[PDB]
Design a protein around this nucleic acid. Sequence first.
DNA 1: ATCTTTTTTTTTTCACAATCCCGGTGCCGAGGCCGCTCAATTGGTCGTAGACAGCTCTAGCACCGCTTAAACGCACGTACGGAATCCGTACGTGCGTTTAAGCGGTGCTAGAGCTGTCTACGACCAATTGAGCGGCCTCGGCACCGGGATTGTGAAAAAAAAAAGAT
DNA 2: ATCTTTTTTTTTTCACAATCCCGGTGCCGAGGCCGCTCAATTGGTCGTAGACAGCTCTAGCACCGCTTAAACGCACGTACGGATTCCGTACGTGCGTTTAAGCGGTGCTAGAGCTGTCTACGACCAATTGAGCGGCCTCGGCACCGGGATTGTGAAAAAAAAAAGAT
Lengths: 105, 103, 79, 79, 98, 97, 96, 97
Amino acid sequence: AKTRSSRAGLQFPVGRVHRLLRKGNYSERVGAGAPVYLAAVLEYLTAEILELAGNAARDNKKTRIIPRHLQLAIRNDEELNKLLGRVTIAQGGVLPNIQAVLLPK
Amino acid sequence: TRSSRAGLQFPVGRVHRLLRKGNYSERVGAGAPVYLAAVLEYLTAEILELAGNAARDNKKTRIIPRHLQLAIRNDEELNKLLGRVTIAQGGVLPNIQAVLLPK
Amino acid sequence: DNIQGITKPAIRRLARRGGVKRISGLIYEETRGVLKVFLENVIRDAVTYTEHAKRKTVTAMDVVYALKRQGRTLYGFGG
Amino acid sequence: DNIQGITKPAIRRLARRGGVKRISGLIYEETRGVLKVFLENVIRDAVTYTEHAKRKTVTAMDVVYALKRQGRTLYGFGG
Amino acid sequence: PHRYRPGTVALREIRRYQKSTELLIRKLPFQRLVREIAQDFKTDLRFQSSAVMALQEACEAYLVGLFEDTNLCAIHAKRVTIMPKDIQLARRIRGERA
Amino acid sequence: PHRYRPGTVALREIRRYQKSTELLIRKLPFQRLVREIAQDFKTDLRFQSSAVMALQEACEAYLVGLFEDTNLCAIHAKRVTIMPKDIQLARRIRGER
Amino acid sequence: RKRSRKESYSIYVYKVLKQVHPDTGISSKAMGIMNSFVNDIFERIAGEASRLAHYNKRSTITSREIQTAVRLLLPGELAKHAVSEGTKAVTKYTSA
Amino acid sequence: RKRSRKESYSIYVYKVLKQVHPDTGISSKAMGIMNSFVNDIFERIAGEASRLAHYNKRSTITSREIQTAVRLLLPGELAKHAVSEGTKAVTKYTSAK
DNA sequence: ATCTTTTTTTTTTCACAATCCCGGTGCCGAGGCCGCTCAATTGGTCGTAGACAGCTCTAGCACCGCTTAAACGCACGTACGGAATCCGTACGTGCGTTTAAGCGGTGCTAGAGCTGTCTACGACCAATTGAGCGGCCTCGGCACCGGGATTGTGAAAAAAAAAAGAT
DNA sequence: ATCTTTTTTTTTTCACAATCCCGGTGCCGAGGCCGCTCAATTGGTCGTAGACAGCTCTAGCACCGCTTAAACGCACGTACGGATTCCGTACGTGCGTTTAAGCGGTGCTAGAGCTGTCTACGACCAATTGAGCGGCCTCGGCACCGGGATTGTGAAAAAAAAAAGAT
Ligand SMILES: [Mn+2]
Ligand SMILES: [Mn+2]
Ligand SMILES: [Mn+2]
Ligand SMILES: [Mn+2]
Ligand SMILES: [Mn+2]
Ligand SMILES: [Mn+2]
Ligand SMILES: [Mn+2]
Ligand SMILES: [Mn+2]
Ligand SMILES: [Mn+2]
Ligand SMILES: [Mn+2]
Ligand SMILES: [Mn+2]
Ligand SMILES: [Mn+2]
Ligand SMILES: [Mn+2]
Ligand SMILES: [Mn+2]
Ligand SMILES: [Mn+2]
Ligand SMILES: [Mn+2]
Ligand SMILES: [Mn+2]
Ligand SMILES: [Mn+2]
Ligand SMILES: [Mn+2]
């Protein structure tokens, strides 16, 4: 295991994350665990959303994830929706929601 | 001192420290602190100007949080700058909705 | 039981500062529920800042920092 | 007078996606007014970025950095 | 005897409380509520006196500020009396409720 | 020959547009507006085509979102019809004014 | 010529994707969003951790700050899982 | 007893107060708000400037970045004056080297 | 206490308008292969951030007992909210006519974006000095209060107008 | 249509609330001075960030002709919002009794916060190399379309059950 990603068991790039944390003026010095921890968090969140969007993509009879599927996946998960509360997803559209009083009687 | 060189009351040296200290950038220009101290001095003055007028209306020589609140919220541009800011001991502007008054 | 320490007349007074004339009798519980959510979201984060600093005393700055996160910046407590 | 190009039916469509069933005739001019204020606010900052970059072309990242300033972050155009 | 018509004293209180800046919730019941809620997150905690006051200034600001928006929702429905549904609308639109 | 009742096609249109994700404003009308406004902030500007779509995505998102809020105000008034005062209430509570 | 290098997260997002859905694809715009999503949360967590240090008079962002940040920044269960996923990766890396 | 040093902007807020209003003071609470105000905007400007540099791939924050920050951050008329007191203060400084 | 009429309810027949779901088909962007290159990896120096230990004393906290003002529980009745009804037109639906967005194709250069040179500027360190700190003190601004000045509120009574009834 | 009588709405005239405000009085924090010290300043060295000049070619702009969907404007009438009445009780007001906040008090110490030691950790560096990039190419996923399967309205009316008018 020459790479740090293999040493940490991650698909995300620990070294790049370590670079970004030094070239962003967050602090003087960056700890050796920080870019491992962070990469893992980012990898975790990434997977979770791709899980749900890929599910959305099967319900719509598709091989490919498109912005709509990400939007459906986020705006239906209660926690993902909160994390991305001030977040516009281009080409996402909106969840189907008609108010009760507007339906005929 | 660098303050008197620019013509300011606000500390130019202090602001230049706080700019490097605060991990805002690798390096900080010579002008930056002077410009920033000056902008800080101005907004302080603008608040104290209108707070001071508030204090005279309430028949007070000394400014208190309320006079700052009243000053800020009655001004249009300060209210927008401090739109998510809670001024402790400030209170609110007196304002009753018309529909609640007896006809 | 503590939550009932935020009494009907206190809640009335607040709504008077809000400029409210008449108050439905169900309000006072709904207010308590809302105040409870607010304090829970603020205090959690405040305590999180206290946890990290390795203390057993929640400071003014811990509260001020937590309010700034939530977008409710507070002037006059060391902010 | 390009603001009229935001046409009554276009505004209708936007309201439909927003779950609106019945639209007053005053809404359309009202909506135009609102849009214009949003675009002004966003464009003002984008341009402020563009000018600082010593450019004569507004990029998408000029807009994206402006939108994030308004608290209205946008995904799919960089950033 | 003497009796004001209902609404006249209510209005007097509005003028009185918007004029002043003092905290309207009794301080000690607030503090015990703060420490109760704090025990859920971490046990055996302490609190600076000012740290409690900072919370109280921020709760009451929030709540007054909330009631302002709540009232407008009642008024919007041709009513003079605030109701839970009004608070709910106000929070919904703020982005606190979903 | 045949005629639907008021509110049926509207309901049908709501269903139609909550499925789709396409922009509902016509692109050119929008782009002229964008340049016009930007011109009055600064002259001789050029726009990346993706910066114009950025704006448009952000505006439509914004307005859709606003209309949602505008509707809940109208229903709060025991009405089905949105009126300027529902937009003004929504934007007051949002802290836009 | 030969266009300048534009860095991304796409190759990793592709890897993570096939781990979860080994047959599922993803369009340009979807990947452009995923790229903005990661970059966003990067700047969020990194930013809170930067402040945490500044608040405590520290000159070092360690996994401890990253951890605290994630708790402040992520809601309930989502924070809870990332925290164990984070700590698990530091544990494994430090040993090896 | 023995000390405990904590820095504030209190002495300069007095100096500015005696300029605009010679014959009126200020309570400690009010001062502690002003103290919070100066610090609040400091971070707000500096932060906006910090991101300016980053976006434009520059290492140095100069007075130019502070100026752009101030235009993005302050509202219309409050900005114009802030730019002018700034630009003026820098000009007197560099000509008294 | 009965039969026939009119109106309300609540299904179902039935075109049929609009849409949903089906394979068929052709365009092109997802995604894989390659090989070149720059950012990540590797091992060595070196300095200081921060953990850990040890001491100082601040500020949080605990039990205590009066003195009120605030909370509470209750009686009473009015003004407010909501249900019920009624009328006019504003806004939805549909059609025929008009308008220009979208398309894709072509032609031109502004200016984005990248390179290389060179130096003015800012990081860095050592020495210096007075601006800003806490500690101490004191005294005038303002909170509190009592006893008139004055400013509205609500209630009968009086006045006017509007409906009501009678020659 | 006209005249007096009776019921409803409008307007002053009065008694008393609650609230200003005004001049006295004491109390503590605003603000001033004071002396030490630590952060700002001055003077000097070194290297590199970025202003500037020169070159490249991306893509932002203009323009024109054709197709056709979308915008426009007008007719028409249904159901929606608003105006009106109207009734019940959930509200606000104002008693009197109950309660725990507030205050000033002394006592005890957890733990905040500062200091001084030192070594594990991360910056900085050159040299080493393979992960990640653009460039290149293609073919399977899906946008688009026509056709027939399915839906959902709607009015109609046809039927069925209730209320009302009538012998
Ligand atoms: Mn198919
Ligand atoms: Mn290869
Ligand atoms: Mn140290
Ligand atoms: Mn009882
Ligand atoms: Mn009413
Ligand atoms: Mn084209
Ligand atoms: Mn050129
Ligand atoms: Mn150029
Ligand atoms: Mn220099
Ligand atoms: Mn001092
Ligand atoms: Mn008195
Ligand atoms: Mn007086
Ligand atoms: Mn001195
Ligand atoms: Mn360079
Ligand atoms: Mn109705
Ligand atoms: Mn006490
Ligand atoms: Mn090491
Ligand atoms: Mn590539
Ligand atoms: Mn077809």
